[PDB]
């Protein structure tokens, strides 16, 4: 049965459950929805989108500015999915504006994310915002995201998350990921090792390419930010990677939004997002990570390395990941392994990750291993719980946080 604009959201969640762009842009057409307010980021990449966008909204909402971001996965709530100046809304704001897109777009059918994304534009078009930031869900240039004509557009790395396959590879991430650009407009680049992709499709579009390492830079007792010989110096670190905070700084840039010092300052001392080496307690410190890939492992063993005593870490995983490589990247720092199945056809077993090892423990559930791991840890350990979105929400559900 079709949900109405006053059930509860989780019926709405449980109908969208069970659901190139034409369809989807028709139906924003049909709402007027391609415009959510009068400046739009849309921000694309492998890892470190929702770290770059946190950082853009933290400095915007500082600058006085009123502010939505969209982003995706979520955590626990559906609710984390749509921030309006920094928070989120009710879920009967959701359900309602679910309802809306239901009655307009008549018999046209759309996805769930597509659906979720209207449904995000259909939130923000109401509240009056001076600036959007759009985080992409997957690609690029077919995601639901990119029928909305942004005024930056940004690729935050590329990294491959998934396991070998004939035709897949940097260049061919890359070259989906710059569809989201747009003719004459700033098309930013924060990856260093830029896929050759990236520049002919910001060619063939007639976009404007500036990328980290040729238009802008950044170096690290604070960091500096430059642009050809313009610099701001001395800026205090953020707890997001440097790298995204420096993506976000050169969208900023190339919008010619006016911002102050003391916006830039504020908003990077602000930025952090739950589950992105978040710190939950100490002695032992505990930390939650949703990396799931070997190069977020990457960024992540950098991290452990200077937190510097064993590492424990419990661990889940989808089937469809580098489950090898990503295990094999943690594996240059985790002592002690926690593994934990995933529920559904699409998780991994617990077994499937130990296969990848050599001493591993197997549990039946993650909340079982995280707490069988703090048993464990002394007061010098570190215990990681990473792996996943859902291992990570998963601990903070047993955390209650």
Known sequence: QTPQATSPLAAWLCYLEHLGLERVKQVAERLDLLKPAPKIFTVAGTNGKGTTCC????????????????SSPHLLRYTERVRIQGQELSEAEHSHSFAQIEAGRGDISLTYFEFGTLSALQLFKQAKLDVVILEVGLGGRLDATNIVDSDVAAITSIALDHTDWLGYDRESIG???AGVFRGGKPAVVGEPDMPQSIADVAAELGAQLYRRDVAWKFSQNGWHWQCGERQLTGLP????PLANAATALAVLHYSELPLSDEAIRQGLQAASLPGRFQVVSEQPLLILDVAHNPHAARYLVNRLAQVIGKVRAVVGMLSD???????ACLSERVDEWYCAPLEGPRG????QLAEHLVSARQFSDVETAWRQAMQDADTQDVVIVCGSFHTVAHVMAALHL
Not at 55 to 70: D, F, H, Q, S
Not at 237 to 240: A, D, E, F, H, K
């Open 55 to 70: 950082t853009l909204e933290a400095i915007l909402l500082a600058a006085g500015l009123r502010v939505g971001v969209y």
């Open 175 to 177: 070259r989906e990921k």
């Open 237 to 240: 670190v953020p707890n997001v």
């Open 321 to 327: 990941k580098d489950i090898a490589g990503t295990l």
């Open 348 to 351: 991994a077993s617990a077994g």
